[PDB]
Amino acid sequence: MTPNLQLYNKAYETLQGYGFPVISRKEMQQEIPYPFFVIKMPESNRSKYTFDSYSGDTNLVIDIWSVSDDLGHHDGLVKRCIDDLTPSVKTNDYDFEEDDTNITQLVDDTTNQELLHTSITISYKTF
Amino acid sequence: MTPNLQLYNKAYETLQGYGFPVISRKEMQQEIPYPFFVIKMPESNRSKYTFDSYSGDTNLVIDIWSVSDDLGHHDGLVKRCIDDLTPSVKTNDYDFEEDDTNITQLVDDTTNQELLHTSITISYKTF
Amino acid sequence: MTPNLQLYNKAYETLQGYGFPVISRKEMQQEIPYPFFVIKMPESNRSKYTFDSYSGDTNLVIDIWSVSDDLGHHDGLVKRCIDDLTPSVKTNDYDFEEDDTNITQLVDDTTNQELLHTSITISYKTF
Amino acid sequence: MTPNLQLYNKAYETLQGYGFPVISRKEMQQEIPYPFFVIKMPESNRSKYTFDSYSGDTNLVIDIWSVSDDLGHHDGLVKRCIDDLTPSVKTNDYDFEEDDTNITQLVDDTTNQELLHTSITISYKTF
Amino acid sequence: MTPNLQLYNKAYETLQGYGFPVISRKEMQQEIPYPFFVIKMPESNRSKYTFDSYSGDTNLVIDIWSVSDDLGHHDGLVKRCIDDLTPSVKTNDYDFEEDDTNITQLVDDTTNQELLHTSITISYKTF
Amino acid sequence: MTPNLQLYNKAYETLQGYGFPVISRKEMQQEIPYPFFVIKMPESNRSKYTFDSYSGDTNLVIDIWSVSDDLGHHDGLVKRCIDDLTPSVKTNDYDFEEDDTNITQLVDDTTNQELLHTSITISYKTF
Amino acid sequence: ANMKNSNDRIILFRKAGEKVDATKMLFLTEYGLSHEADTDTEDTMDGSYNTGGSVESTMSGTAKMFYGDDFADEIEDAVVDRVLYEAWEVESRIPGKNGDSAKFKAKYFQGFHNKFELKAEANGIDEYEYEYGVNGRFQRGFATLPEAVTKKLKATGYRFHD
Amino acid sequence: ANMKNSNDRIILFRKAGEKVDATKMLFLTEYGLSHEADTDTEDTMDGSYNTGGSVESTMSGTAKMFYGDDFADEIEDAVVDRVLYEAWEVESRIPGKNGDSAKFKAKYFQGFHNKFELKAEANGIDEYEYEYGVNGRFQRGFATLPEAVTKKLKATGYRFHD
Amino acid sequence: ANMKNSNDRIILFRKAGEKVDATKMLFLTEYGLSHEADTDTEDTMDGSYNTGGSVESTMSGTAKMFYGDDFADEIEDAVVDRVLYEAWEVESRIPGKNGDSAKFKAKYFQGFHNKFELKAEANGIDEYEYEYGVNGRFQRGFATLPEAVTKKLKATGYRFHD
Amino acid sequence: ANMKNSNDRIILFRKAGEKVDATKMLFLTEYGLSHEADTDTEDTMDGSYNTGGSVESTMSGTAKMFYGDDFADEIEDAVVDRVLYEAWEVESRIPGKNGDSAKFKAKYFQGFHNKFELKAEANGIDEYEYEYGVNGRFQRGFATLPEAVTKKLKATGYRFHD
Amino acid sequence: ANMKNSNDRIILFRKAGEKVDATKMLFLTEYGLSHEADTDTEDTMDGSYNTGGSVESTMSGTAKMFYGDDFADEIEDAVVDRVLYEAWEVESRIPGKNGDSAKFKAKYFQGFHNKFELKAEANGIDEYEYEYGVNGRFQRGFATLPEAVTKKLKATGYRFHD
Amino acid sequence: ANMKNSNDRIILFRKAGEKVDATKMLFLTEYGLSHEADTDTEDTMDGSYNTGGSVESTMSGTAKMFYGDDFADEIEDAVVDRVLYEAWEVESRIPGKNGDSAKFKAKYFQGFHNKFELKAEANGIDEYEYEYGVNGRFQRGFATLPEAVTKKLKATGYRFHD
Amino acid sequence: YRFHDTTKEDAL
Amino acid sequence: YRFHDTTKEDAL
Amino acid sequence: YRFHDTTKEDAL
Amino acid sequence: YRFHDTTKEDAL
Amino acid sequence: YRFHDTTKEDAL
Amino acid sequence: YRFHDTTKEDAL
């Protein structure tokens, strides 16, 4: 497998344990209670790094939707994700090390409802 | 809690003490007399800083709406915010230190009324 | 008061002395002869500068509208503004020093009449 | 031939060997089963490099479309392409050396079906 | 006068001597034969340069419209303007020195006729 | 002549020798068999380079259209042009030295037909 | 947490031997204090060993000049006239424990100013930078801050104030 | 895979000759350990040859100062008073094999601190940097990490914790 | 507030010993004045001490050359002919108190020019830079500015004027 | 065409005089070899001439440290203990012609390691860099690559493999 | 206003002692002329004083080489053969007053070329740079420009012309 | 116009004293030739004067190594074995006038290679750079280019060809 | 020398 | 000198 | 030397 | 010294 | 040396 | 030394 799939699987193996539903995209006939996790397949750069290995940069986005009724809970989810997937992720072929994590958070009204939408971006150096 | 939420709560604890209304987003059935404060959830970058800690960058946006009838009072609110939230904010888990503050004002006619819209951005380094 | 307001007022106290009308925005029932001045609330960055003070960059835009019948006079207004507002402005709390000034002119036909639109930007370092 | 066409031909002679269909663009009367490869003509920069040769940057993009029912297989195609086209490609007139490879994936719903769209970019220094 | 107007005038005093019509913008009731010159009011930056003077960058654009029947003549006008306005221009208050000149030519079909549009930009450092 | 027109003419004197039609822009009543060359007038920067001369950067774009039935031939035209116009072009007043060439190809379906569109850009230093 | 900002250090000077309150160094831009031992090593076929040479100690800094001032003029007098100066470095946020309750943790130096450069450039406030050579062992202690300067004469605007 | 992060190195110090537990160097920014042989070469018409001069060895680093601390104050005392200091470099993720099961692979040095600079700048946490001169052959071994410091006193926030 | 702009310093020169009004150094781009003591330290087993060596003092600067001028030609004559020059640095905005009411605070130097470099580059106004070596103690005082140069002969355009 | 990638060079070492297979230097980041002649020139009024001094030769490089390793620890032992080391530089893609068919073109050196620096930085894999001083004339030849290391123990992922 | 462009300086050379018109240095890219006094200072307990050492003077520059030329070949001959060269620096826009009406203000030097480097790089027109060491006092005067070179042989294109 | 491209210079070498055709230095990236006179100056109270010391001359360059080659291996042999090498610099576009009609303008040197460094970096073609020390006066002439190398063995692709 | 406080009451 | 462990039980 | 004013009335 | 191969069969 | 003009009529 | 041509016919 690519590092993209390896990391993406490890991220499922993580978030799917909380019990809240995890999706890559919502289909029309699929009923999803709030809060829920959207997770998007990583981007990965690669380049020659030593005489014996590549190294590169893998960017993961996971994306947390909630009703705005309870912000402390929604932030508890965001913290839970960051604490599980940082500082390092180990998988069969690849190692991942947090370069930086970016939290950006919005109030979304697109759905006639005041949702909270947090995007968590993590840049992993990979070896 | 994330630093984002901790900061956001400390900003409410501050601004709500002036007695003018503070809101994240106005709902349709909710009547808000001017002047009023809009306050927008911080962004946070995080990266390794020492062998023993992270550091990063937390960006706070607060946003003051007033009718243009009296500019000196509006600017009094702007200065009162800046003086309360700078140079440093201390909270339970995190410290915040002003790196810069940016004040921009626009004359807003979107609402068939001449409003003053001041956006205050504060960038805190955080530890 | 912020530096933004202090500068904005010292600009009014200057430009309002030429006798031509000075406005922030024109309202629909308000009749304004040409030429006239539009003046827009400054932006201000702030950052730590010494162990004892902030310093920062405050951006002033003043904006001159005239009929194109006589360009020498319009340029006389431009030069008069620049000579009154540079190299330095002093006010009660703040000092301002010209970092640069940018003059741009357009020929504007939005109003079924050939107008001249000059935008004067002055960047002040402030202390 | 240019390096563009030399590379493009070597790319066909690789990918077309897997038995899945390979196209530069789909025509309306042409029925293509999933999964399939779109392959797009390289860009090339060329410049003087030594007193005796040019050298330059040749940018290859291949583009893998699959139904989302089985992600492990799609990733297997991705990895198979990368392992065949890197680290180096040799052809009659030109040599190509991987500078970097960038893998990006999207979930594509444009077609009333949940497709996986992987874009593979490889930047070859060429001599 | 500003440097903008001083340069704009010395450009008219040159171009208007060729006999072909020179305009800043065409008005609807005004009939202009081809070829003709559009000349646009300069931009000017200013900043402190020595303990005794400012200096700055003043940008002049003049713009030549012709029918495409004879390109050698249109290029003759382009070369004539550049030779008459570089390397230096002297005027009463200001000196101007060519920093660079940029020529671009389009073919323009906006008017149901194939025109040639050349834009000549000259950046003058000014003292 | 400017260097622009000198180079543009030298490019016609080359390409017009192949016996395919060469055009600056196709007019509606004009029938053009494939393949054909579009050619666009060079841009030219200029600046002082020595105490005795200017020098500058002149950018030539030629643009080759063909039906996609035979790609080897289209690439033959691309290679034949680049081989005829590099590394250097001499003309009466100016010398041109290749600094870069950039080749980009697209498959174009704008015309209800699958055409190949190759853009060849060549950056010449000039003296 | 509890990271230590640079601007909480207060640098004070006074001319040695005259009975006056120490004067604060305003508008510091950057600062540094340096200690350096000139150890040699001595080789022998029994084995090399390291010998404890003497230590040089020096304080260094940059400041912006301003019109309501006379102190940079004193620095440039002192470097030429070789005047001995006392100096303190005080940590404005570590208070003394008891008895010293009103004082703040400090280092005391005395020594000579050894460098002064004015730097002036068009489009800029002119800086000066200085170096000070410490004599001997600097002495640890607690220092009284001049309260009239540090907290009474507050000023509005971009000048720091409570 | 199995690349070695810098931050897994733990640097410890103690003043030589006093019976106390070693104190950890917190908030290192950057670190380096250097060994270098001062070889000469002797020419002769029979041919040149290289002669095995002595080796100089030194440890160097930068840290951020903080208020809950007293150790940079010890470094700056040590450089001036020429106090002999023991130091360890320990690899927090290589454990000892048996008997040493609770210990981690280490180098032990003793020597003197030879440099200390404070660097302070407006808009910045002030750094200090130091240099330590190793005496003789550094000694290989396994070191006990002070478990109360390294794993018991965890703290929330940006400070690293499990 | 009250920050000190660089361009308010006025630099004046005249050839020593000839009875003429001082001539202003026009179009300075950057400027600096430096004083530096060469103090060594003498070691002894009773303890090291620092010895008060002599001070070297120097003034330095860069200017743009222009056609209505003859002064850079005098600088380059002076560096070769070793001509003694007086020079003033005057603060154009600090006036004297009384009696000196028409004068401005100044330093007076006399000494020799020791360096002159022309720098010329295609696409540029050519600079010259110089260095001046001060003799002895510079002298404090108040200096009369040449009013005809500084305020009477104003010029339009980008040349500074009221 | 046929340009020579750096990463096709294989660098091998072993401690001199012990009968063991050479160990490969894994994870080189950058590499270089330098030869330089210390020529003087002697002037005479009949004319100057150039005199053929001796040549100094040295090999240098940077590597990433990793946990499945013990070789950096050998380099840092060798620099301090002045251990003589053999080293090879082998060109992994030039095979020997006949008889040497299984071997690859190489240089053989023996000499001493003369430098080792660890460089550790927050947010980074810690590198080590080394220098090695060649004794005498390096010797040309063909070298057998350790096939079990170079081609048998392949690993998945970003580690290079066929 | 009246700022002085670099490209208005004309640099001329000729081999010393042969009766020929001076040849212009075409395609200068950058230029500089330097004078610098090697002053010592002598200390005494009565007070230090500054002593007037001798002055070194030198001219330096860079040019682009071209095919219709033979002069860089003369510079590289001159540096090796130690040929004495005369040189002028002429200000192409300051004319002489009367009698000298056709001449332009100049400096005259004679001396030796002391440096010549060719610089060639792929994707570039090769430069050469040179240094010229002035003998003695340079002499002021007015110089006739070679009118056939400077104004008669004009050329089209990017070569400067009226 | 007629600017001189760097890549029209051809650099050739051969081992001194063996009867073989000169071999071309392929894939140069950058190149330079330097001459520099070690002039002293002698002061006297009658006046200082400049004395004509001897000249050092050297040629320098950088190239890309490739697999179809054996010449960099000769450079690195030559620097160590102190082998005397002849070298030419030829201007591929200045032909000789008559009789020399088939030859191109050149400089001839002989001397020793004095430096060779091989620079290899991950993600890069390894360069080597060299220095060559010229003996005596270089000699002017016209050189025959090896036509079989320069024009017969043309190759397709990015390798330059007509 | 010993430590002396900043104030004139503890002059050198 | 030999190796000594970090703890006070192995003081120098 | 002492201080001398800029003007010719206070020549050296 | 002469050339020696990498392997233990050609130890120094 | 004195000043000499550029032209061959004022050769050294 | 004098000039010698590149070719083996003009070997040193």
From TrEMBL, chains A, B, C, D, E, F:
This is DUF3168 domain-containing protein. It comes from the Viruses. It comes from Staphylococcus phage 80alpha.
UniProtKB/TrEMBL annotation, chains M, N, O, P, Q, R:
This is Major tail protein. The chain holds residues 159 to 170 of 193 of the full protein.
